């Protein structure tokens, strides 16, 4: 029942040291024909697991932020979290 | 026997570096059907552990401020402080 | 006569290199119908033997933390520590 | 009643020194028309018997991870474990 | 007056090259309706005469570990050690 | 009442120096239309009487391992052991 | 002849990486029926070996700070420092 | 369909412990008459498999980064990856 | 369609922690025979990524500020941003 | 249907103690006018039967690795394996 | 004339590969009615011959550490070192 | 030939991060029977290496300030600077 | 054609983790009869590879800074960089 | 002609992995009637071969630091370095 | 056409387990009247076959590094590599 | 004038193939009322003529080891060596 | 013309399997009134023919190491090497 | 057309049990005025027929290795192999 900001923070909180690096690297180079906007390298590189989820939402809004998170989870082969996100997607 | 402002400051003083970040993030996105009012992102982001407890009370009053603190403690999984708050709640 | 936090730290301090890995892996995937909450993969993976016992208690409280520790000791076949925990359980 | 992660870890824990090497070599070169994704050589080569089962699941999900484990057991002629896995497959 | 761990290590220390192999092979395939739990093939196969006695106790506890050792001594026809164990069994 | 692994080891333990060589040579060249899989020359050549029975079972499973052992006993003219095996075959 | 603040800093300066963590964990959970007051988790967690000795004294005064340090040294099994403190206790 | 940064990271992720060392050593001493610029020893030496692919591109651009990766794969005798890169080269 | 001030701020916003330091160091020591004027060490050293782009333009005007930014990007080996700037240069 | 890496490993697995030594000695001194590259003495000397087949392929690619294996089998007079390889050569 | 820490390190330095294992196993299970405190399994298992003598003293103090070392030397049948220790015991 | 204020600033400028903390802690608790006056905790805690030397002189005068600096250098074991100060003391 | 500040930064950027430490240690203790002035321990110890080259020049001027860098490169046995500096020395 | 700090660093740089551990252990327990001051366990334990020589000098001054180094070299049986130090002692 | 660093690494890569030990032992005790500088025991002892060739060049430069390698090859009786080096010496 | 260890090794070195077997068999079953401790079957069975004399002394000390050797020589009817030992017994 | 370390290594390299064992046993029990220091049992027991000559010199210096080697050669009846050493002794 | 290493291995492979012993004994005592270098007793004594031919070449090079083999064949009266070698000598 909490805000999306907490949902997203919890999943990002589940990514271990390397996974986070790879996730950040997908955010910065997000493919440019999906209506999503890539993130600046500086802010992302310095940002923590709860400063990363507060940036993704600010840049793209809830709907798009969730889609990005799901897609990137698939892209870095974290299928446990990919399946959990897809089954726990809010009804917008 | 001191003012609630000190009680609240002591618990917030017990939250370590990351916990505080998560606590602030729950205050800013507090769920909107509980008669509580969310806090502005700027003041919260800059505020210290004793500037955070002086803001929560100013925005919502004692009763509501305490309920918010208890609920957020539960929400970020700091059950030691959650149980301590619930057992030390003033008689309003 | 010391706090539970020290009791738990001592047992975790008794787990050798591999055992700790297996213990962490049981915490992260704790079976979900026991009123206990699983731990995030990142914090657990980085956490030391005294940073693991300070996390288990924060997430679930004393009673549940002790039950989890006992059960996991049984689950990874460290019966010396399982029997010692069960005979040294505080009276809550 | 424990998570699949423990089931898989137990079988991998049953593979002796050489068998593990051969198992890793089948994971890295898994045949590419079975809907399964091969694993990177670096992470596999460094990974322990409980770091191998936490990687297989992350890459392919439970269902596929189990099928891969069963097939590879057959492929390296460990028929005791092959038969045990097939008779102890969870109902997904 | 020393811990059981030393008692067990001394007997295992008395098994010659082949006997140890046969002992390990009985531990791994221990008959499954005696309330005792078999040992993993990897750890046993690599384990020394003092790493074997520290594993048996960890898996099954003192009482059961001693019973297993006595029974296996009988099973591999080392009756000198079988008789010595039975006459030197601690009072639990 | 012990595992098949011990049964097989006992018979192999009954083969004298030359017989073992001949037995190994039948395992490596087992006739290929009986649903049984031949063994690699390296592992067999180095393997002891208890490392030979732990390999046969791993390659072919109990049922087939026993049939192979019986047939080879017949093939190398060790009719005492052939008759003993056939009369002591477990009920699978 | 220097202030207690330096004495305490020197001993804390003698605790290696892990010991300091354990010391901090005893300060935060100091047993509550000894007339001593526990320390907040945030300040302790961030505090250095000379910021830890300046906090203990501020919270409890010299006499109590020294008693706490001695007791905790005993509690974490640093008996060299425990014996040195007890023999070098100022005459208050 | 992902950015080159991910392609390159995946191959580098496929280099095992020693291979990475050798790859880094070819980057630092890249032959100076190919229009490519060598990398500084410090940043390379500290950089991870995903911090190495984010540095190569920043120093030389996509086209040149890919050519360098292909050539070095050839140079350290990792012909599987050399052939895979050459067949999966983007159309610039 | 926004003012150059925003364009420049966005690129500077893309420089990570160290890159910014190096960029500032090129601004302060800009080579003196290009019709461009170097920046004072104090203001540059204190200036943020949006206080750096508001200073470069004030000192040299749009045309020259853009040329300086492009050249420095080349000079610190950030070829992604160098190529992006050159392809997105306004028609003055 | 498995990767060439397994095919090659199986044959190498069929070479007995001395044969392997001779095979390694032919790899290290492979005749230099056949478009094949010899292997370093260190890695070969330490490498196991499954670490030898993972090295040959990495150095020369599938086609050449298979040709080398066939030729060396002929060279050390293991005509059973030579004939089996030639009749089981994949269609590249 | 050097500190006890060096004396103890020298004797431990005299224990060969297996002896050290047995010594560690006596430290971990030291009999509990001698006023001596057993050592944790993790730290002992990882500790070197000079990290073992720095742990024994820290846990029990000089007097007790020496008595423990002498007794264990007797217990593992290293009578040369047992006699040397007893004749070279400092006057406390 | 410059004012003492510069001499003192240069030495304080030579104290690294931790040393400065320890130096400040000796100033605040300076032993009270030497005719020197201790410094307030607030101003010292906020003061820089050139704001520390401008405070010491203001509180105690040149002669006493120099003596204090020399003594504290001795007290925190910075003997290089202690010896340099003593040999470069002005003739008052 | 860039300022000396960039030249120096590039070489310092080429020193790996330990080398930098050793370089800093030579700067702080530069031999005192060469007309060069040593650097303060605090600023050097905190300074980065681009904050080290901006300090050396500020303290001694271009000519002397370059001579110092060359000499120290020789002193810490980085002869590749020593030879490169000597061949790329500007004409002052 | 370089500072003692470099001389000492070079010898410490000559001590291999274990020797360094033993050297550190002699520094921490230096015998207390030689006018030399022992080093704290924390700083020593974390300190590198060039952070160890910068600490010894800071604690005791050149003369004493050199004497300590020579004596400890003798104490850990590194007679090559002991003889080299004694023949290369500066004239103070 | 690659850098000397690769040439040297390839030959060192050709030295088997013992040869490398002997090579390292010649580097550390290189005869002192040849204008070459010996290597420190610590770095050499820990260094790999590609960390050994990156150290030799850094200490002595290309020309001298090659001469040292050739001479040591002769000294440890690896005449195949000695002859190959001498015939493949670059024209400096 | 050499250590007893050499004396004992020389006599054991004088026992021919069978004699050694018989000697080992007397050590393992040494009669239990002579203040001497029997040897484990494993270590004895594997031990060489110089690994047998280094074990006897370690288990029982010089005096007892010599008495055991003399008695066993008598027991296996090697009277030449029995008489030589008795006439060459050290004065303890 | 090489260092003594190589001379000694060559002779030790000439001792066959058993001789080395006997040599090690003389080093460990070297007679104690010759100004030479015995070697620890652990390091010697694990040490190779080039790790044995690097230990003898480190413990006793060249002169004494050579005398020890000559004497032990005489003691184990390797008179060829004894005579060769005595005729090839360096002039110290 | 294979490397000399195989030629030599084939002839050595033709020497029966005793002949090999005699061959080894001629290698170790090769007459010292022929420009050939004798082999160490340890490596030769342990070396197999393919480890003997890989040692002879490494010590003396092809030309000399072949001459040595021919001469020794003559010396031990294996004239069939002597004549075959002389007629099959490569043209160097």
Properties at a glance:
homo-oligomer of 18 chains, 92 residues, mainly alpha, 6 helices, NACHT, LRR and PYD domains-containing protein 3 (chains A, B, C, D, E, F, G, H, I, J, K, L, M, N, O, P, Q, R), immune system, nlrp3, Pyrin domain, filament
Distance from first to last alpha carbon of chain A: 13 Å
Helix content of chain A: 55-70%
The most extensive contact between chains is: A-B, 10 and 10 residues
DSSP helical segment count of chain A: 6
Structural class by sheet pairing and helices of chain A: mainly alpha
Proportion of residues in β-strands of chain A: under 5%
Q: Which radius of gyration of chain A do the C-alpha atoms yield?
A: 12 Å
Largest sheet of chain A: none
What global shape of chain A is seen? Answer: globular
Oligomer: homo-oligomer of 18 chains
User: H/E series of chain A, N to C?
Assistant: HHHHHH
What's the domain count of chain A?
Answer: 1
Beta strand count of chain A: 0
Task: Describe the protein in words.
18 copies of one chain form a homo-oligomer. Chain A is an all-alpha fold and 92 residues long. Chain A has one domain. In chain A, 64% of the residues lie in helices and 0% in strands. Chain A is built from six helices and no strands. In chain A, α4 packs across α5 and α5 runs antiparallel to α6. The interface between A and B is small, with 10 and 10 residues. Chains A, B, C, D, E, F, G, H, I, J, K, L, M, N, O, P, Q, R: It is found in: Cytoplasm, Cytosol; Inflammasome; Cytoplasm, Cytoskeleton, Microtubule organizing center; Golgi apparatus membrane. Chains A, B, C, D, E, F, G, H, I, J, K, L, M, N, O, P, Q, R: This is NACHT, LRR and PYD domains-containing protein 3. Chains A, B, C, D, E, F, G, H, I, J, K, L, M, N, O, P, Q, R: It comes from Homo sapiens. Chains A, B, C, D, E, F, G, H, I, J, K, L, M, N, O, P, Q, R: Belongs to the NLRP family.
């Amino acid at each position: 029942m909490a805000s999306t900001r907490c949902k997203l923070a919890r999943y990002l909180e589940d990514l271990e040291d390397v996974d986070l690096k790879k996730f950040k690297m997908h955010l910065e180079d997000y493919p440019p024909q999906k209506g999503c906007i890539p993130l600046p390298r500086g802010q992302t590189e310095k940002a923590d697991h709860v400063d990363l989820a507060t940036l993704m939402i600010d840049f793209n809004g809830e709907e798009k932020a969730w889609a990005m998170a799901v897609w990137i989870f698939a892209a870095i082969n974290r299928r446990d979290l990919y399946e959990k996100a897809k089954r726990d997607e809010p009804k917008w």
